[PDB]
Symmetry: D3
Subunit: 175 residues, 6 copies
């Protein structure tokens, strides 16, 4: 199942991301159920917004919210929910939501999948529009849902992203 | 796998539905294979019709046709085949087909997924057009397939739907 | 999982094909990972081309490239990645790529799924345009990827396709 | 505008069809307004059905219902509403609806657009499934609309189709 | 052309709306050019948002921003840009943007197109979620565009909507 | 109509492009008919290829093939056939086809539509993958059509593109 996919070939540089939500999709918030490996509908989002990138997680990690760490993956074409993409972390958007600190990593397709993102080595190489769109999305996507909310704290670099990967990988290792 | 998803958090009021066919999709009749949990193509439907709602089943139930009980789930946006949605039963369309009585439950997204359907408490709260579309779909979707056919028997309420859930859950329990 | 799906009800005449890529889709080359059964992104294809048919494989087979044997399945509407379709082999396009001989079977939906393809009994019954499109696709889809390439060797009949099925089924049987 | 498009290069053998509704589309019944040439929504159809082919009309014709003659055009991929396709008539489905006799021509893409349909010379060469789907569609698409209804009278050949073209062209000529 | 479409059969009760942007579409802000009647790209919107309803205007009106009055039209399925739908006004969202007061009417499909919206007689009958989504959309869709901004002032009823229609119709009449 | 759209606000720097074919679309080759301004189907393309960018023309120009000059426009999301986008030329792919020299301009969305392409000032700033995809597309898209063919001659800069615009604008001016 999706439950059995590694965190990565060589974390934190070389990771796999399980996709839950495609870029530019209908506002259905899918989440993989850890017990079954199945894709569940968490909610029908209430704002008229879409994820700027594919959205998913790194398996065999545990963030402080109790779920695997959250990752955005830009691609040339939207990915299928439940698919897995090999990627390389390049930055992280720090934020707190209704449950606490819950960072949003950005990882680009690995060179072996495409050469398109090889020039993106660190967070400053991400397009400014994309970064602003991501920040705006997380600032506002919960605006019409009672008891959900976000404080966006700012962009940090690839080293920071990799530290978060390692930390949440080690957290799951000793659960 | 999808094989391991509960029938519900608290049946029959609070159920999970495994989706096989999205609303308003191409006429591919997918079915989950009970042995593998994989999505198989049962047939390419022959009429130029689409399911008015997402279509799927409640796991760990057994109807008289030998399959898990059939459920229609209206949503704001079509769901992915193989995904699972938490729902609440609100009515049932009774019918017989070429194999016998094989009712079609209607269950709406659970309040925790959306508030949109909370006002739908019983079958009379479903839109009349939607109910008529569902009835017409099942009356006609087999019209061009030899040895497939339907007799639609009528709409019944949420209590009737819940009774069917319990009955087919208990049937699977002792198989 | 998809790992547990038979090669066929009655190979080589009656087979199942696990779909990885839909017909006429975005240029994402998905592949099922044999370890996990999950759909991985192999690459983002570099040419502006699409598969003329759904593309996938027969489980529990092993071709000389180390993967299960490759199958194209024409359908009236594109199939979902990760779904399984019952089919009947009708021809094969022989070719060598950067790793060696790696034939592309064509199998049509089984009569039980549709009557649409029953008249296609052998390779000469496939539409000429479709065959030419398939040949052209494999001749060119790697043209912009370094270290990937193809030599198309020609169309052969249904008996040849069935021989390839049996051979790669027997190869996996003794791995 | 679309108002100024010829009926055909060489009617009735060589015609243009203005497309109003794509094949396999959402149930929005678009119609070109004769005054403005704009695409208007006639209605949101009430049954869960789709047109088996693109649907439109031959400009500068007048059928007995007061509109230009109705044409179905099968294509490999759905056409855009408001686009124009060169075609060749091959058959006609005779029927009466709530307003009277209102035949449905079938015309295939002209050889200059594609070779795919050149083998379809007359109504017997159309696929049987497609013809049955068209007949079933018109028999049922008005089933949930009060004061709309259909009596399907049967398939006739290409000569009959061409006669209808000429007759409605001549009708518009002297309005 | 679209330039020649009436404001309505019987304004302000019975209007036509020219659609520029479909509901739930990609973030391309199309606008009809008054000179040519063609659909121009005004901009590629910068936030990750979509219009909750189809969006367009009433022809032969002039609002204070210099364009025809703006209308949102909910439908069961998204409409084609450049198409025209007969509708009935039911409410208005008052707001000011970077150019001044520029209200957003809501008009539902006319009864002759569908019975689905007949129960919506006034603004209080619109779903609360939809109204909140519309308000949130206009509050935020310009958030990442320099020199574009919005102050949302509040919902008013069908009479207010009709007054705005009449006022901008009369404004265009004497330009 | 589309017939009445200017070549540009300030040619050759500031142009309008009428879109005929969206990026990444089905293989329907639409063309605007100069007489009617309507979108006609020229052909159903025979290779399994798609245009890497939106494709269209500059109105009120005449190239040596007798049609207005051909332009590719990259956008974040595909454009609607028949829509018009303001753009800025940045390069040109020179080639000859079955009718003669028939260059393919590349023009990016004008700064007023988006800031995304402002950094693309000349042909060397276009992504290498995109340029290679465009070249490969034109080298191969006619490979399965008798009496259609292409010789790609190479990329030239923005000044060359602008010269071609001016030349074909002046050609149409004196027809
Ligand atoms: Ca989308
Ligand atoms: Ca998450
Ligand atoms: Ca969270
Ligand atoms: Ca999280
Ligand atoms: Ca659909
Ligand atoms: Ca079932
Ligand atoms: Ca049944
Ligand atoms: Ca059943
Ligand atoms: Ca496609
Ligand atoms: Ca393979
Ligand atoms: Ca290979
Ligand atoms: Ca292979
Ligand atoms: Ca469709
Ligand atoms: Ca008609
Ligand atoms: Ca009629
Ligand atoms: Ca008619
Ligand atoms: Ca959309
Ligand atoms: Ca406007
Ligand atoms: Ca405004
Ligand atoms: Ca306005
Ligand atoms: Ca596409
Ligand atoms: Ca051209
Ligand atoms: Ca040419
Ligand atoms: Ca040309
Ligand atoms: Cl791991
Ligand atoms: Cl993306
Ligand atoms: Cl990498
Ligand atoms: Cl259970
Ligand atoms: Cl639904
Ligand atoms: Cl509930
Ligand atoms: Cl097996
Ligand atoms: Cl196919
Ligand atoms: Cl068979
Ligand atoms: Cl004419
Ligand atoms: Cl069609
Ligand atoms: Cl012809
Ligand atoms: Cl008027
Ligand atoms: Cl809508
Ligand atoms: Cl009304
Ligand atoms: Cl001009
Ligand atoms: Cl593009
Ligand atoms: Cl510019
Ligand atoms: Na909130
Ligand atoms: Na039947
Ligand atoms: Na290569
Ligand atoms: Na009726
Ligand atoms: Na702003
Ligand atoms: Na050729």
């Amino acid at each position: 199942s999706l439950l059995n996919v590694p965190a990565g070939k060589d974390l934190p540089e070389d990771i796999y991301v399980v996709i839950e939500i495609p870029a530019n999709a209908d506002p259905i918030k899918y989440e993989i159920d850890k017990e079954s490996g199945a894709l569940f509908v968490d909610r029908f989002m209430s704002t008229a917004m879409f994820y700027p990138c594919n959205y998913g997680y790194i398996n065999h990690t545990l963030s402080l919210d109790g779920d695997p760490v959250d990752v955005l993956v830009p691609t040339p074409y939207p990915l299928q929910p439940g698919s897995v993409t090999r990627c390389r972390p390049v930055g992280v958007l720090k934020m707190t939501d209704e449950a606490g600190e819950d960072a949003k990593l950005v990882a680009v397709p690995h060179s072996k999948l495409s050469k398109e993102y090889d020039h993106i080595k660190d967070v400053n190489d991400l397009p400014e529009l994309l970064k602003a769109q991501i920040a705006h999305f997380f600032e506002h996507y919960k605006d019409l849902e009672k008891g959900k909310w976000v404080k966006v704290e700012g962009w940090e670099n690839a080293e920071a992203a990799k530290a978060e990967i390692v930390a949440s990988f080690e957290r799951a290792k000793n659960k």
